[PDB]
């Protein structure tokens, strides 16, 4: 018989800190007097092939540091036993406890490691022992005999029954649709469309929380304040308040709710634009402030220090650099390259532009931009259909998508909206100018459709038009980005991949162990989303263009546009027409757009992930057969296309899942848009919005061209930059805007940086922790090839006078708005 | 014998009150006097001897007392055989001079007699000789009554005075001399200025002779004066209000400006923020020396305000539109309708290619090429298409500037190039902006330095090109301020004012169709020898040529200016603007048809021609009496001969022969000193109040210039913060702003071209018709300028946040209101 010490190391903290210490709602009570342990045989009893029984030992408290409190036990193991392969873990107090590490002592051979990182339930909560394997990883059918029972029944403990509404303590993982975004419990007008689960409403399923019915509204879950995740997914309990989702949470139920409170004219613009350079230099006087205090310490580039407290925002890097640049036309396409959408851009192929939409119902389908006005701007370089063949003209088009809508959005008080096309010029020194913008209001109100196109001009009028057809163009662009680029392609359709993960795929499948450390922390921000941003009269309807039919376009964009297998970079830029295949060129990509600084550093963050994606499959799986045999790694990709996804489950687009490269495309496909895809839409948000005439939101007024009353353009005649301000977001919209945008592209203290840190599996073996040295090397040197693209003057859409360097996709950075750095997952 | 009342009538008031005001140097009880000898004078000699009869004479008495007019009063008796009287000499007894409104006659039986005065009378005691006031009615020399020739030449000789001597206050002499006063090089060998005038090298129409001692420290510079003697009644500050153009910018120029440098010490701290220009109209700047005054706060009240706070108001650009001084539309616009409308011309010579030495200022091909040109207009037309169709247009600076840039490159705080900046006048015609060329000579065995910018599509390049306009700005804030403005109207005019007193007599009718274009203009010139272009005055302080600003402007008058393209038509013809053609509207085919300036000044010169045809041909029925006007043939020859000696050559002065080159002359003259003068002086301060719209002076040499890799990377770093460096200091920024804002300021008492006439204007039937006709005419225009204003085709005055026209608008109120045309260069 062998003796045997188990030491237990657990943090000190309690769940729902946050919510007490800013006010929405002791430490003795917190620490329990034991821990029932078991340590678990990798190997079945010989000859009677039945599994060992666990050998048991209660576990007591020891010593404190560092706010991590151990608990031991002194145990002896039988020599017949064989090698440890787990450890079973039952709480005895009342409350749960979370549990870092559990270290096994005494053995000849060396320390067992068990790595937990979860929180124990109380066993009155739920009564199921809590199972911990080593950091040794296996495929299904490499499971060690003692283990595969265990294994199995875990996966069926995560999976439930699919009813019941969720405890806080559960564990349960699975999906439903977007019924809880409305509130009509509160009012009819509250009332929203469920998304996902019909061909019109087609939608990414979330997490199941089982909440009860509104009796009201019967398809509409019943609000809460407290939306459930699997109890581990909850993140922000275990890490400091600058964490994510701690500085989210404070943003939006204390510090807009507090802006809400001085910003009481909901109707109230920019009298003058020296109003706006004061949100930067003297703030805004909030009195209301509930724990003012905490919250200059979560949230200081917005709360300072003295009673009431002082709201004030720090300069965007766009005025930083070029106070004047937001105006300059070059900088509005150069930011559809290196600004915070990169994503619309697209090559055009056919000429005229011509819509899709029923005539009989959007009026004439042709485009006004027409072929004389764009040679009338490009002459002096090419001809149309010159440009045509060369792949020189390109769009972000909106018009079809945007204009079903229009009738509806216009019926809301403050805010309008137009089908729209923004058409642009590749020149000879590789940048782009814009050549026209085309805004178009279908047949309404017995009126025809009304269509114009606008463009840079000779003459003030034209200008001025050209200027405000720019605003509605980028309140557009600002909702697309929003809606689409950001909330749907990276938080809200990954969020389907990491419940198949945990339903699926063991804590031990190498693959759960590869895709976790890119899953982290997203359900969890998700659900605050679904709480306040997303929601009926949540932040994103009160600001943005589309109003309370927001979050259904993304929805449209899903059901027309989105397909698992273009939305890896290759496949996207390949799908956009900017790159084809080309064994010559870098990366196998030729660019229609060369200095394109998204695409060019997201193309080396490709090769480098995928790199190590192939690394790591390849150790586990050595051909097809092995691939096609794991039927854990078969049943998680086949729930993801019939649950996850269950509105495309039939589209034939889905890749297949049968040999290590198809895995290899999958899992770079996934951890890219978690890295890259979301930290290149999400961190530049502050740098290029935050001056928000730069960005709007929303365009609240109609062009003065539009239907024009001779007193109404007579106003536009006398004071043009009135009616700019008129059009520009409200004080309220504005200062709300601005604070959600500033917490969004601030990276925590303890951001979890790509390729930075290993995880515990991954450098417990060898050959992996090797792999991953490569990884990080690769990741340090693109640092060093993309500092070096940022001083390259031929580089005109990175380098200039007065232009912001492209330093997104830089993987590594320090806590902050720094405009750089690149998560492993979507933490914010 | 017949019993006749004189009633004087005689203003209260004294001179230099403004000084005493301001604080810097009588009682009402002792201003004016006890008598006055009246002596009235009969139009007919003797019919028996031919002699002239002798005057009849009379003490006025104090009388009464009224609104500030005391009157004096006298009665006597005139013989029976007298004649009707033609003029009343004058004499003051009083120590101090007094100054008569006008001598009323009271008692013939034909109607009262009425002497129009407007003039200061000195004590017998500075000067005894009497004063001649005449009627209303007008005279050629040989129409003179008879009683009334050798009056009438005395007084002439009176105003001429003996060529030498030193102009005392109570003086009314009228000559000539040199501009040889704007120096000071006794009390600094740097504050030294050369003469203009004089030399083949420094050619500049003459000013009002002073007489002070010349320089103990060198023998071609006049003495400085805290007082600049004009003739005495030229000095109308004195008469006028507070609120009067000339007190307004002597309160600017000798208290505010003062007291600005006074706080604001440091002659290089530029401004560090955007946000510090706007603080100018947002906030002000507290300058403490100024409560030492507290009537400023009346005089200036845009101005000095409530430690007195100084604050700007928003110039009417701005008003309309925060972001119209980034566009380049704009930019272009304002070469047809901003301050500065007379400098563009047609490009008729391609490629462009200077006249300077080779072998001295580097190869004379312009870096603006075909290729370039074409890259921004082939969407319309080829670069020949546009030169055969007129489309190409330029303001080219270079050959004039280049010269100066090696010794305006020495001064610390300043720099400068050779410019060039070329237009495209598209389809609708609006002009954009195709380049500017920016030269640097071969200097400091450096080789030349050339570079051409244009509007781009990358930021690099697009600020690199508003630096270049930020120095062609400058370069043309220069020209405007010097030469549209300053030479071609204010300075070459003086010579023809000082000519009209010494050789017209003021009976004489052209003396009187002169006379309202002329006032005022003597004192504010004055005003400006001694405190704006003067060594280290108000120009030179904040301009780019610092120093060198004045010998540019005569410059510019030696090389170009010449009398017979003064006139609106020929300035025009001469820029190749205009062709003349008699199907076009005035006879005029315009290359820039909607051009607002030249739109509207058309309208007032063909307006103003016609009064003045009328006037001429009331009096001058055929060329023998043109040719037999001695007083106006010695008035034209010694305007050719001593007001612009240096020019006394030239083949060009047209001839004064008929009456329609009489009418010629005096149109070109009056057009100058009314609408020239109001359309580069009235706008000012819309347009470059702003100034980084307009900014008098570029500091800093573009980056692109022999570059650091240092320097260039702070110019990427932070764009602009060189802009900011390049811009005019905090303290040229606030005397730049506190001088344009008065020099824009219509008086209360503007007199505007066309509105009221003149006393002798009014006295002859048949010219009150005309100029009640003229009046109309311009009334008339007025309504069509306003519809101009609304025409949405004529997009260079009609547009979102664009100023609309109104410069050429003949009426006003007071104030900076960009509109109105005075009669004068009033200020
Ligand atoms: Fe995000
Ligand atoms: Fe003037």
Known sequence: SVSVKATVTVK???????????????????????????????????????????????????????????????????????????????????????????????????????????????????????????????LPLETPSGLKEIREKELVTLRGNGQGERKSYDRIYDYDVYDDLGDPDSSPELTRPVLGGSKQYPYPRRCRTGRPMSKIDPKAETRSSTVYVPRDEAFSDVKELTFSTNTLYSALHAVVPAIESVITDTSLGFPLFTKIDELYNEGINVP?????????????????????????????????????????????????????NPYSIQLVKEWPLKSTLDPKIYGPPESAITTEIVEREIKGFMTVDEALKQKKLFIIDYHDILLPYVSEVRQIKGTTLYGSRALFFLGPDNTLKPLAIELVRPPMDGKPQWKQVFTPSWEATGSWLWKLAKTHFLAHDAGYHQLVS???????????????????????????????????????????????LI?????????????????????????????????????????????????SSPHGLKLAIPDYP???????????????????????????????????????????????????????????????????????????????????????????????????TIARTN???????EEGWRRFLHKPENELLACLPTQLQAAKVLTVLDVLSSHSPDEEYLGEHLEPAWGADPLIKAAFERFSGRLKEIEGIIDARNEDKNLKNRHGAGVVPYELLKPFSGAGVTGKGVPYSISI
């Open 486 to 532: 950001h909330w749907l392609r990276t938080h809200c359709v990954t969020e389907p991949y990491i419940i198949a993960t945990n339903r699926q795929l063991s804590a031990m499948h190498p693959i759960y162990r590869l895709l976790h450390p890119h899953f982290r922390y997203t359900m969890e921000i998700n659900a605050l989303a679904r709480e306040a």
């Open 703 to 709: 062009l003065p061209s539009e239907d024009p009353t």
């Open 535 to 583: 929601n009926a009269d949540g932040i994103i309807e009160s600001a943005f263009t589309p109003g309370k039919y927001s979050t259904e376009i993304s929805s449209a964009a899903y059901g027309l546009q989105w397909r698992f297998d273009t939305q890896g970079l290759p496949a996207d830029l390949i799908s956009r027409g900017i790159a084809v295949e080309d064994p």
């Open 598 to 696: 998204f695409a060019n550093d997201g193309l080396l963050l490709w090769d480098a992930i995928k790199e190590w994606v192939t690394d790591y499959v390849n150790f586990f799986y050595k051909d097809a057969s092995m691939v096609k045999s794991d039927a854990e790694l078969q049943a998680w990709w086949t729930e993801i296309r019939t649950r996850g996804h269950e509105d495309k489950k039939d589209e034939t687009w889905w890749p297949d899942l049968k040999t290590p490269q198809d895995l290899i495309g999958i899992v770079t496909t996934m951890v890219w848009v978690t890295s890259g895809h979301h930290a290149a839409v999400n961190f530049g948000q502050y740098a290029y919005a935050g001056y928000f005439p730069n960005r709007p």
């Open 288 to 340: 209301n402030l509930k724990k003012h205090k905490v919250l200059q310490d979560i949230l200081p580039r917005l709360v300072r220090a003295a009673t009431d407290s002082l709201l004030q925002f720090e300069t965007p890097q766009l005025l930083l650099r070029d106070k004047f640049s937001w105006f300059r036309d070059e900088e509005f396409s150069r930011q559809t390259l290196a600004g915070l």
């Open 12 to 138: 000190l903290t309690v769940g729902g800190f946050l919510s007490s210490l800013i006010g929405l709602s002791d430490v003795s009570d917190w620490l329990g007097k034991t821990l029932l342990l078991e340590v678990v045989s990798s190997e079945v009893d010989p000859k009677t092939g039945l599994e060992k029984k666990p050998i048991g030992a209660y576990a007591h408290r020891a010593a404190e540091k560092d706010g991590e409190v151990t608990y031991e036990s002194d145990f002896v193991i039988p020599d017949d036993f064989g090698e440890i392969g787990a450890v079973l873990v039952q709480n005895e107090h009342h409350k749960e406890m979370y549990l870092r590490y559990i270290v096994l002592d005494g053995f000849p051979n060396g320390p067992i490691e068990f790595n937990c990182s979860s929180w124990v339930a109380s066993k009155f909560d739920d009564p199921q022992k809590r199972v911990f394997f080593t950091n040794k990883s296996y």
